[PDB]
């Protein structure tokens, strides 16, 4: 009786959701997923720490038993999959950068290890995962060259980013390859992301897309997001995915006032925020091809623990699978 998000936006972009693997054996989760979403991301199950293993010898092997379940589900229900993520400073074990004795690998050895990782993961899902977050969160505006000093930078160096895109494009030449980041609409970080992606495109690096995470709060200025998308879309042939959208009911990451249940006026403010947001996304439908929400429903949200244990209601569906005020205001950005 209520309308399907994917159908309402069928002319505009894919509507996606980030999922932990347990949802596939919960009939009520499966009902909400298949009604509303034609795209899915693994919330954690395709990150390097979720696939990388060592045996007793210290030899590296890959466990795809959980990741394969996402492709199986997607094929059964006619959904596309965003692969998240190949190269990241986070959720990657420290031993991946080291030999049997805990010394840093040589640049040559780590380039080889990166190549094998990307060829194995992207190669296994060739033709089945239409888009990859190849590199995640490489930008740090506090550094002279604007690049985070992770183990990737320390062990390989600043070309680790373009090498990751090269290897992913070799493993699946048909995949759309994304650079993904957060605070992507803050002016200093936005300008560094623009410059990184534009320069890589100009020297023929196979990057096809910017992933804008859109981890937002009610304090955020949607005007800044409009401006960021205007800047990014001036890069010839780039498309944009909104990769991890959520809207915290809080106005910072450490609120002094925490809600047990959300005030009506706070759900209404969130509904108006999501309305303005989807107006800006539709305005940029020429460049935006996928909008993915970081969680199926409010009680599954990472925002209930990652910044401290608290209730938050950041999504379009509540704890009882029911549409929120924001659901209706998002639908009405079209209807
Ligand atoms: C899907 C999430 C884990 S991405 C998330 O972005 C955040 C920004 O608020 C953090 O800085 C973390 O680096 C990252 O885990």
Domain residue ranges in the chain: 5-332
Mutate to test the pocket of ligand 1, among 43, 50, 90, 242 (most ligand atoms within 8 A of CB): 90
- Which residues lie below 8 Å from residue 101, measured CB to CB, with a gap of 6+? none
Contact, 251 vs 218, CB < 8 A?
Answer: yes
17, 152, 196 from 108: Cα distances, Å: 37, 12, 23
Is the CB of residue 184 below 6 angstroms from any atom belonging to ligand 1? no
Nearest CA to ligand 1 atom 10: 182
Nearest CA to ligand 1 atom 11: 182
Nearest CA to ligand 1 atom 9: 215
Angle between helices 222-232 and 187-202 (to 10 degrees): 20
The closest-lying atom of ligand 1 relative to the alpha carbon of residue 91 is 15
What's the gap in Å between 247 CA and the centre of ligand 1?
A: 14
The closest-lying atom of ligand 1 relative to the alpha carbon of residue 43 is 1
| Known catalytic membership, residue 184 | no
Mutate to test the pocket of ligand 1, among 92, 137, 295 (most ligand atoms within 8 A of CB): 137
Find the catalytic residue in 43, 137, 162, 244: 244
Is the CB of residue 244 below 6 angstroms from any atom belonging to ligand 1? yes
The CA distance from 19 to 65, in Å, is 16
Q: What phi and psi, each to the nearest 5 degrees, are found at residue 63?
A: -110, 105
The CA distance from 181 to 112, in Å, is 25
The CA distance from 297 to 232, in Å, is 30
Q: In angstroms, how far is CA 286 from the centroid of its own chain?
A: 20
Q: How buried is residue 163: exposed, middle or buried, by Cβ count under 10 Å (0-12/13-18/19+)?
A: buried
At what resolution in Å was this solved?
2.1
Task: Please give the CATH number for the structural domain made up of 5-332.
Answer: 3.20.20.80
What's the gap in Å between 216 CA and the centre of ligand 1?
A: 11
Nearest CA to ligand 1 atom 7: 182
SS3 letters across the chain: CCCCHHHHCCCCCEEEEEECHHHHHCHHHHHHHHHHCCEEEECCCCCHHHHEEECCCCCEEECCCCHHHHHHHHHHHCCEEEEEEEECCCCCCHHHHECCCCCECCHHHHHHHHHHHHHHHHHHCCCCCCEEEEEECCECCCCCCCECCCHHHHHCCCCHHHHHHHHHHHHCCCCEEEEEECCCCCHHHHHHHHHHHHHHHHCCCCCCEEEECCEEECCCCHHHHHHHHHHHCCCCCCEEEEEEEEEECCCCCCCCCCCCCCCHHHHHHHHHHHHHHHHHHHHCCCCEEEEEECCCCHHHCHHHCCCCCCCCCCCCECCCCCECHHHHHHHHCCC
């Amino acid at each position: 009786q209520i309308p399907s998000l994917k159908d309402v936006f069928l002319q505009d972009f894919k509507i996606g959701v980030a999922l932990p693997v347990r949802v596939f054996s919960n009939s009520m989760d499966v009902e909400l997923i298949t009604k509303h979403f034609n795209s899915m991301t693994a919330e954690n199950e395709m990150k390097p720490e979720s696939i990388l293993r060592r045996d007793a010898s210290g030899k590296i092997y890959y466990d795809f038993t959980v990741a394969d379940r996402y492709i199986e589900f997607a094929q059964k229900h006619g959904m596309v999959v965003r692969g998240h993520t190949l190269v990241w400073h986070s959720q990657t074990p420290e031993w991946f950068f080291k030999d049997e004795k805990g010394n840093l690998l040589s640049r040559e050895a780590m380039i080889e290890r990166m190549r094998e990782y990307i060829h194995t993961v992207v190669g296994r899902y060739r033709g089945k995962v239409y888009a990859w977050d190849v590199v995640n969160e490489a930008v740090d505006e506090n550094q002279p060259d604007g690049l985070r000093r992770s183990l990737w930078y320390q062990v390989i160096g600043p070309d680790y980013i373009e090498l990751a895109f090269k290897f992913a494009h070799e493993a699946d030449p048909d995949a759309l390859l994304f650079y993904n980041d957060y605070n992507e609409f803050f002016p200093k970080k936005r300008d560094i992301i623009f410059k990184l992606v534009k320069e890589m495109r100009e020297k023929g690096v196979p990057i096809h897309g910017i992933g804008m995470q859109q981890h937002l709060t009610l304090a955020d200025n949607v005007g800044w997001i409009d401006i960021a998308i205007q800047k990014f879309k001036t890069i010839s042939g780039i498309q944009i995915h909104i990769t991890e959208l959520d809207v915290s009911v809080y106005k910072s990451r450490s609120p002094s006032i925490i809600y047990q249940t959300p005030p009506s006026e706070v759900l209404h403010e969130q509904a108006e925020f999501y309305r303005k947001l989807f107006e800006i996304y539709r305005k940029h439908t020429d460049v935006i091809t996928n909008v993915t929400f970081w969680g199926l429903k409010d009680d599954y949200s990472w925002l209930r623990f990652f910044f401290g244990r608290r209730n938050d209601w950041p999504l379009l569906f509540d704890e009882n699978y029911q549409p929120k005020p924001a659901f209706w205001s998002v639908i009405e950005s079209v209807s």
